[PDB]
Amino acid sequence: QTSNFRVQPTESIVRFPNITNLCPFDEVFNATRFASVYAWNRKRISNCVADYSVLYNFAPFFAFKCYGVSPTKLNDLCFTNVYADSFVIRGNEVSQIA
Amino acid sequence: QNVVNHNAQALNTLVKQLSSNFGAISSVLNDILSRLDPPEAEVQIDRLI
Amino acid sequence: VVVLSFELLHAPATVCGPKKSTNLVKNKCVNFNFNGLTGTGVLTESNKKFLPFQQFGRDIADTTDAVRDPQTLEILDITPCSFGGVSVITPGTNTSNQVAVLYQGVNCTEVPSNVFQTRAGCLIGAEYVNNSYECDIPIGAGICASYQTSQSIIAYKMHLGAENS
Amino acid sequence: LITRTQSYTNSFTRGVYYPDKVFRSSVLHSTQDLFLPFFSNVTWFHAIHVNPVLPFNDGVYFASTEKSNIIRGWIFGTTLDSKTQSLLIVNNATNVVIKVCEFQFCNDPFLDVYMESEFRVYSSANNCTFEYVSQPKNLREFVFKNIDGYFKIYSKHTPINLGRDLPQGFSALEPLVDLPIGINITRFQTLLALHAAYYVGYLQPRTFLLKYNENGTITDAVDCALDPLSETKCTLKSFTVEKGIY
Ligand SMILES: *[C@@H]1O[C@H](CO)[C@@H](O[C@@H]2O[C@H](CO)[C@@H](O)[C@H](O)[C@H]2NC(C)=O)[C@H](O)[C@H]1NC(C)=O
Ligand SMILES: *[C@@H]1O[C@H](CO)[C@@H](O)[C@H](O)[C@H]1NC(C)=O
């Protein structure tokens, strides 16, 4: 008795249930009018599936910065809840939001 | 019949020790590889070994 | 301006990203991950019938042997992939450098020339004659091997002894 | 105005539920979980309208045999005040609504029927965290449990004959729903609809030996800590024992 033999795997399979019940990011990014800074809005988002890729349709061009997280590995994480604060400021006060 | 039973029993025991933490984080080894860093993984692997 | 705040509180995580799934392949030795259940083997069609809330099946030894596919709600049997011992049979280097190989406990069709299927396993490199002799090199389940005429490794059935009446 | 009166009765080996989601075939399996012990003393309540709250600890077994439309749901909480979160469940002929909020519950709540109004159950709602909507003689049994921030409900409906409630026999409760609420539960109450009797028992840590048939259904069980005879069956891992000393 000299050797041992085992066949090796050749492929990888991952199976998960269907994707549905998407989070309402479209309502926040596209609406009638954004709130007024002193009186801003806070929306609580929970119990849904969030895909941070459809964002680019609603024009996040001028600025996109992410503290504490990574813009790519966002949908790879799970959180208890997420908030969305939206308002309107002048084009020169954006630097103050940090 | 007795002889046969004895042999069978032994085999089952040898299987059941596989699904045991043995004082480690978990019995599954691949999870210990995935979650943990090489410094702390070695002691767990040695413990299971 | 939109500001997003991510919170990890002490509660079950109910906001996650999408989890993509690949296709389903059968009759192959593959690694699989069914809804968090990770393993490897061969997936075949099952005849079992789970209850509507049950997701996978375990054996008497507490090993997973069946699984339900999350998208199409069918049952699949999980089977371990082939493994075994490899033994080498020789006439002795004083006689020849030819050898035969035994694969213990596998079919000759499972990814292993004269090939022969026995009860012990798959035998490669030997010729299976009929007429019997005394056992020379035991193989198992009544099969023995020898070096006979030109000269080659042959396999045969064990012969108990001369008939008398 | 509702008045409640208590009496006592016997469990008779009821309250068994599937603890896992694993299919098993013709196997005896030993588990350790929160169960209702065999032959225990459970409380029988008679509510009449011509009601203090109940404690919640390590889960509750609830049973009823009313001809429906009288009992509608339950209230779960820890203070039943505006300063703590509370869970509310109401059933109608069409749907089931589960909500966790910061309620200001009234003493002796009930549903008013004239349209079904909820101005006699609470006064304010305040912050609401989780909401869920789904689908809605005879004996109906429920098991309520709360572990690691998950609220689990098991249920079963059984057509019963004779005139005895909680009859003799075996029936296992399938999982009904699991809710990720992550709140604290210490007390609970029952809701009535006005234009009732029920059974309450408490769960305890316990080890059981369950029997699965070839179709994957639980058919019988053994409680280890009941009798010396039932402990031998669990050391031997078998439902029959032969003559001797163990
Ligand atoms: C997940 O989505 C797939 C389609 O992408 C569903 O498969 C279809 O299901 C419908 C159900 O009405 C059938 O009529 C189709 O014939 C199916 N098509 C295929 C290609 O399978 C699947 O049912 C969804 N998952 C669940 C659990 O419903
Ligand atoms: C045994 O003899 C038969 C002839 O009847 C032959 O067909 C068979 O191959 C023989 N077995 C061997 C050679 O192992």
Tell me if chain C has a CB within 8 Å of the CB of A52.
yes
Q: For chain A, say whether D99 makes contact (Cβ under 8 Å).
A: no
Nearest protein Cα to ligand 2, atom 9? C130
Residue C19 DSSP symbol:
-
Q: How far is the CA of C23 from the centre of ligand 1 (A)?
A: 14
Determine whether the interchain pair B19/C62 forms a contact, defined as Cβ–Cβ distance below 8 Å: yes
Smallest CA–CA separation between C76 and chain A, in Å? Answer: 13
Contact D135, D95 (CB under 8 A): yes
Query: From CA D86, how far away is CA D187, in angstroms rounded?
Result: 10
Domain ranges of chain D: 3-246
Give residue C121's identity as a one-letter amino acid code: G
CA distance D97 to C10: 25
- To the nearest whole Å, the CA of D180 is away from the closest chain A CA by 9
Q: What is the resolution of this structure in A?
A: 2.4
Residue whose entry in the numeric block shows the structure tokens 């085999």? B11
User: Cβ contact (<8 Å) for A29 and C9?
Assistant: no
Q: How far is CA D63 from the centre of its chain?
A: 7
Which residues, at least 6 apart from A80, have a Cβ–Cβ distance to it below 8 Å?
A: A46, C7, C8, C9, C11, C12, C13, C14, C15
Q: In this structure, which topology does domain D3-246 adopt according to CATH? A: Jelly Rolls (2.60.120)
Size of interface B-C (CB pairs under 8 A): 5
| CA gyration radius, chain C | 27
Amino acid at D183: I
Reduced to 3 states (helix: H, G, I; strand: E, B; else coil), residue A5 is strand
CA-nearest residue to D127 within chain A is A44
Residue C69 three-state SS: coil
Q: Do chains C and D touch (3 or more CB pairs under 8 A)?
A: yes
Q: Calculate the alpha carbon distances from C113 to C100, C121, C124, C125, D2 in Å.
A: 11, 16, 7, 6, 91
> In this structure, are residues D19 and C54 in contact, taking their beta carbons and an 8 Å threshold?
no
What are the DSSP calls for A35-88, one per residue? -BGGG-EEEEE-SEE--TTGGGGG---S----SSS-SSTTTT-EESEEEEEE-B
> DSSP for D82-125?
TTS-EEEEEE-SS-EEEEEE---BPSS--EEE--EE-TTTBS--
Contacts with D129 from chain A: Cβ below 8 Å: 46
Residue with tokens 């249930």: A17
Closest-CA residue, ligand 2 atom 4, reads C130
Q: Residue D56, Cβ neighbours under 10 Å: how many?
A: 19
Q: What experiment produced this structure? A: cryo-EM
